[PDB]
Amino acid sequence: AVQKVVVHPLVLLSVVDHFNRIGKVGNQKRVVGVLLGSWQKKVLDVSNSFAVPFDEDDKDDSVWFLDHDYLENMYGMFKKVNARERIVGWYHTGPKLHKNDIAINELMKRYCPNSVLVIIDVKPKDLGLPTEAYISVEEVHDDGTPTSKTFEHVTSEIGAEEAEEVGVEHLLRDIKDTTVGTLSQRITNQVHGLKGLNSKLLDIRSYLEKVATGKLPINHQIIYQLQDVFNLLPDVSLQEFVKAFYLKTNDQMVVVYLASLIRSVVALHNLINNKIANRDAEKKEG
Amino acid sequence: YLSKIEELQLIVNDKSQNLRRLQAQRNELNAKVRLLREELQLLQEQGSYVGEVVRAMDKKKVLVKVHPEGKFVVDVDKNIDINDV
Amino acid sequence: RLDVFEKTILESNDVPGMLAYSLKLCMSLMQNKQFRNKVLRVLVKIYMNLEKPDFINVCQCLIFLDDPQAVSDILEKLVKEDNLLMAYQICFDLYESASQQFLSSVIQNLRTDQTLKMIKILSGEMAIELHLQFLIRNNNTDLMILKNTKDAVRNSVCHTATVIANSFMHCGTTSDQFLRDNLEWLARATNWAKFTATASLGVIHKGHEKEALQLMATYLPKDTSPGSAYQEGGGLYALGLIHANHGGDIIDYLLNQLKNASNDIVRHGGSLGLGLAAMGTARQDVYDLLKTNLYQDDAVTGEAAGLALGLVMLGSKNAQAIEDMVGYAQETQHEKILRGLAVGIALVMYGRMEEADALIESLCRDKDPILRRSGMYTVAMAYCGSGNNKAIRRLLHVAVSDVNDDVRRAAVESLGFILFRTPEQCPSVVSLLSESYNPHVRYGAAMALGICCAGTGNKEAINLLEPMTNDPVNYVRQGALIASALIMIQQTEITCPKVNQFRQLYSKVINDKHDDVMAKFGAILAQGILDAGGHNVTISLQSRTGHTHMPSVVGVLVF
Amino acid sequence: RPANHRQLTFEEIAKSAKITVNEVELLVMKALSVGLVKGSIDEVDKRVHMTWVQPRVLDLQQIKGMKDRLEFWCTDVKSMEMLVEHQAHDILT
Amino acid sequence: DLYSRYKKLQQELEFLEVQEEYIKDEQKNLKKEFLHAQEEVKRIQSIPLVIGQFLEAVDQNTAIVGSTTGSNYYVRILSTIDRELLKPNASVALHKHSNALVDVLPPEA
Amino acid sequence: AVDTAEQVYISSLALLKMLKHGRAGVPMEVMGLMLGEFVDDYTVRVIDVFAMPQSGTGVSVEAVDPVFQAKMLDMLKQTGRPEMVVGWYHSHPGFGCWLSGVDINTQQSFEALSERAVAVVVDPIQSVKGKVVIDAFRLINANMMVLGHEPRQTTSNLGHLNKPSIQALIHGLNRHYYSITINYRKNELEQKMLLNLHKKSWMEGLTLQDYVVKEMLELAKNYNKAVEEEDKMTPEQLAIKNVGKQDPKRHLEEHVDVLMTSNIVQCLAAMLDTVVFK
Ligand SMILES: [Zn+2]
């Protein structure tokens, strides 16, 4: 039951310079680190983290390395700089998961009410959202096995706390606040239309690979029960919103009445005082 | 005389220079509106207060006695005179 | 199409000189390289078809049509027809306005009394030494200004623009006066005043080719003896200054001085000097040792490597200089090294006019204002005059719409190179450019006035610069200074009445002691350029012969 | 039936559901107590109106042949996105 | 001169075609930077408003204010407030750090 | 034995830890150490600015814990990079960012051991975006008046550093101090991903969120009438019959643009149902 946090990308620049470490230390390709913070509410904020020297065998992938020379005494350091910003979770790159993530979560779960494996994004080219959270879950099944622990999608965002723009919005030097309705909306049209419909191509990836070469969560319990929500309105010919078309006349009512009346006042606005300034400039320039 | 009308008739199209004369003048106008509002970091140092001069003396010094305060003798700037005191 | 063209160059009687000024007028409305060389090679042959042979045609087609064998054919006509006195056009225009690469190829093609005057015109030393004789005989100094600017010397322009002043007055006076009059003013020397206090001997000794080594007898590379290598490196740089475009063995001797097992203490000035010396000759050995100078990983000699390698590879279209200098550009850990390599890979492609578009688009593709600045320098050198809009559209886009003012500055320096031909419209566009909001581009607009309108008789440029020195930015006031010095070259008081106004006014504003010395930084230099020659000499960015003079273009853009 | 006429008449109900006209109302008020379907059933025409339902368990042939809704959605909302953007194309700006 | 009298006309014509395209785009960018200028007027204050009162104006848009800090000051004031709204010792707003007028409130007390 | 105009290619994390250290750095002034690498003579880099314990006693030279130095560099050695200190930071979060009277000792106390040890003054408690609030200086000393106080070698870097030249006691402190040049690195290795997360997140996350719509238009159109009547109280003031008004005193604007973009939003919101549905 966790929705969203507030994210400072400052220690994500620490993810960046540990992404500089791993390019020049050795065989470790992926960035795996430990995410400090403090549960405040269902909304949350993070101020610091750190990056473990981590190795992971390709053979029997449950081979973690989280040193307590690097945990306990560095935890003493991070406790000495502040008592507030303690552990809240950890982080690794890619989007998916590796296998050992569950045990790496359960290692530092002994310190925290809910340790979180926010899977992080170092080379962002994605179609959906950035780094995203997972909470401790016990959902097991309707079958009744020993208790499931694979941490389920209990989401997150990139929230903005406070000032920091002394740095950030001086470091912009490029960007502009679009006075919304000035192709900002069609930036959104591009991103949400194309990136939700090739997210629908990820959905047809699910609904084709789980039909051809895909078993047990094939109709898990949330494929068909959500094909309901897909079956809000999937219909065949033109889907016949017969209520909603005169109701959309009732919609377009307000919009184009403000267009006619208000934009005729906009006509008055530009045109009358524009003629004043214009013709005064014109012949009083004589 | 075949093509020898067309360049001079495109010179007839040179009200673009006058409509853009208004546009380049407006470029200058609002660009230095902007640059004039950019001066307002001059605001950001000095509420340089009203001073209380009894009288000046020689050697390029005055007597300023600041508004709830006491006598502080100092040097002068370059754009007003000892005569101007 | 050459059907009505051929019937109307084999046409009937008018003045044949219709076709002679039609050479330059076809060149005035020329758009492509496709029938430019066609008309250029068939009008010279229709002058070979008309019974009266012509020499202005070969004076133009040697510098626009680059045929080293047709000049060898009519130079066998110069040996056979034997008249050296009509031969002056082809002979000393071949000396005057020829590309140095084309000079080496044409002295290759030509040698297969004028039996030795055919070599003496190509070396052409006669005009050099009587020009030097003019530079020692004529003089008009103003030493009171030299003292009242000598009052504000530092590790600064005064220590350099005093010798720039009386050395652009005297390119090779072969005489000491600033060495003679003082030593304590000469004793304000710290690494660049040291570099300058040993390079200034060759600054004041341009030309005078034979006595270079035996005049820097004091400045052989073991004969300085301070504790510092710049006081001995600028001297070998000064050898490179003297040995410009006509070396012999001393090109290879500065090369060997760099290769006398000496790392980056001789190279300090000697690498700049060597690249300046073998400029455009397209050597191999200097590229071979400037590859390890390139991979020094120290930009105090690495910028010398990039600059000097661009100098020795002028307009190369090499398959390894371009690629193997753009390669080192990305992974270096500095960007003043990228200034060095920037102007180097600009100079490596000069005047190709359609070829470098891949490189310009590849480099302005990137995000770096220094590398895009490199691209603007490179499009200033690939394009000069050819406003085909393939330059000016995206060039103007990135020129004035961009976010960093240094690439914008290099673009408004590119404008003055692509707008040399008709400086009539240039007030109407650069006075518009004046309106800028930002310090570097205010200054760059001033530089566009400067390098664009160098030789013009414009007064509107002066009218522009007067509020530009009425500007709280100090170095745009020096932009007004130096650019107005570039509008006051070559011209006297009768040309415009602001000449002596600014001449005494620059000393008048150097009287103000509480100005920035950045506000009067190039004020001694504005006085020096203000008497470049003493109005004896002038810029040559587009020569009167018809063809551009590329080492002067090199001088100004690296300047 | 995915199709409309979701104001269904009571007729198929009283025929195939072995129920009567006086008991279709209990048939759907007991379903209001159940809570998987909550129709706004017509009672001037006696029509048993269809609102939202709890659909099925598995239609594996329609898990394969839902392309006529899924890929329908994908390429058609994609195409009409391209059409809205293509009519407002050169105000890219 | 029927050879280049009429053909040099295009030469200095292409260039102001391109500037005719160009000044449009520069106006297209300066509205952006005008919005940046206007918003960067308001990043420093008008939450943390301190209270002085007006005293007198020397010249155009620069005046004298006493304050509730004890002393008196002479301040450069913006063009935001209308030039007659400062007749009494009215309730005005200044800056903590750098002491300049932002707004004026006519009633109080 | 020679002086050149230096440069500081910053890791942005330096200023990020300085802004955290100043934001959370409660306006009592505090002290730390700066960690980079001395690359060459004309440039330096700071790759790191690490953190200090809550030394709320006073800024002094004794506040440096050497066992914290040892363990800090050791935990950098079990992390990937064992880099070198380049100097020291500090925080001046209340006043106008100028050299305190302990700094005038600890600067040369630190650069007696190190080479440069450039001071870094910060105040993110100024205001939010448009000030450039960072401040660094290089202690020139009375030992170096032998030769002149003019490196000058590369110019206009110290010329644009000379372009502000403005702090009261610091331009008093032209003596003992010439500043150092601070540019911000070609940071696309992070500016890339900051831009990408910045605009892939600061508009509706997954960006399918708004695509509130109409009762905000109800309140907004009542705004857009309630202020339009005082908008039209201006052309009566334009009827001055002949001329009795000094300059236009223009109140045309701010109700073009709001109507413009707000009802662009409403008409594209009327699009949005016909967009999402097919
Ligand atoms: Zn401090």
UniProtKB/Swiss-Prot annotation, chain B:
Component of the 19S proteasome regulatory particle complex. The 26S proteasome consists of a 20S core particle (CP) and two 19S regulatory subunits (RP). The regulatory particle is made of a lid composed of 9 subunits, a base containing 6 ATPases including PSMC5 and few additional components. Component of a complex with USP49 and RUVBL1. Interacts with PRPF19. Interacts with TRIM5. Interacts with NDC80. Interacts with PAAF1. Interacts, in vitro, with the thyroid hormone receptor (in a thyroid hormone T3-dependent manner) and with retinoid X receptor (RXR). Interacts with ERCC6. It comes from the Eukaryota. The chain holds residues 24 to 108 of 406 of the full protein. This is 26S proteasome regulatory subunit 8. Component of the 26S proteasome, a multiprotein complex involved in the ATP-dependent degradation of ubiquitinated proteins. This complex plays a key role in the maintenance of protein homeostasis by removing misfolded or damaged proteins, which could impair cellular functions, and by removing proteins whose functions are no longer required. Therefore, the proteasome participates in numerous cellular processes, including cell cycle progression, apoptosis, or DNA damage repair. It is found in: Cytoplasm; Nucleus. Belongs to the AAA ATPase family.
Swiss-Prot record, chain D:
It comes from the Eukaryota. Belongs to the proteasome subunit S11 family. It comes from Homo sapiens (Human). Component of the 26S proteasome, a multiprotein complex involved in the ATP-dependent degradation of ubiquitinated proteins. This complex plays a key role in the maintenance of protein homeostasis by removing misfolded or damaged proteins, which could impair cellular functions, and by removing proteins whose functions are no longer required. Therefore, the proteasome participates in numerous cellular processes, including cell cycle progression, apoptosis, or DNA damage repair. The modification N6-acetyllysine is found at K15. Component of the 19S proteasome regulatory particle complex. The 26S proteasome consists of a 20S core particle (CP) and two 19S regulatory subunits (RP). The regulatory particle is made of a lid composed of 9 subunits including PSMD13, a base containing 6 ATPases and few additional components. This is 26S proteasome non-ATPase regulatory subunit 13.
From Swiss-Prot, chain E:
Component of the 26S proteasome, a multiprotein complex involved in the ATP-dependent degradation of ubiquitinated proteins. This complex plays a key role in the maintenance of protein homeostasis by removing misfolded or damaged proteins, which could impair cellular functions, and by removing proteins whose functions are no longer required. Therefore, the proteasome participates in numerous cellular processes, including cell cycle progression, apoptosis, or DNA damage repair. It is found in: Cytoplasm; Nucleus. It comes from Homo sapiens. Belongs to the AAA ATPase family. Component of the 19S proteasome regulatory particle complex. The 26S proteasome consists of a 20S core particle (CP) and two 19S regulatory subunits (RP). The regulatory particle is made of a lid composed of 9 subunits, a base containing 6 ATPases including PSMC4 and few additional components. Interacts with NR1I3. Interacts with PAAF1. Interacts with TRIM5. Interacts with ZFAND1. The chain holds residues 39 to 147 of 418 of the full protein. This is 26S proteasome regulatory subunit 6B.
From Swiss-Prot, chain F:
A motif (JAMM motif) lies at residues 90-103. It comes from the Eukaryota. GO terms for biological process: double-strand break repair via homologous recombination; double-strand break repair via nonhomologous end joining; proteasome-mediated ubiquitin-dependent protein catabolic process; protein deubiquitination; protein K63-linked deubiquitination; regulation of proteasomal protein catabolic process; response to ethanol; ubiquitin-dependent protein catabolic process. It is an enzyme of class 3 (hydrolase). Widely expressed. Highest levels in heart and skeletal muscle. Its EC number is 3.4.19.-. The keyword Hydrolase applies. The modification Phosphoserine is found at S127, S201. Component of the 26S proteasome, a multiprotein complex involved in the ATP-dependent degradation of ubiquitinated proteins. This complex plays a key role in the maintenance of protein homeostasis by removing misfolded or damaged proteins, which could impair cellular functions, and by removing proteins whose functions are no longer required. Therefore, the proteasome participates in numerous cellular processes, including cell cycle progression, apoptosis, or DNA damage repair. This is 26S proteasome non-ATPase regulatory subunit 14. It comes from Homo sapiens.
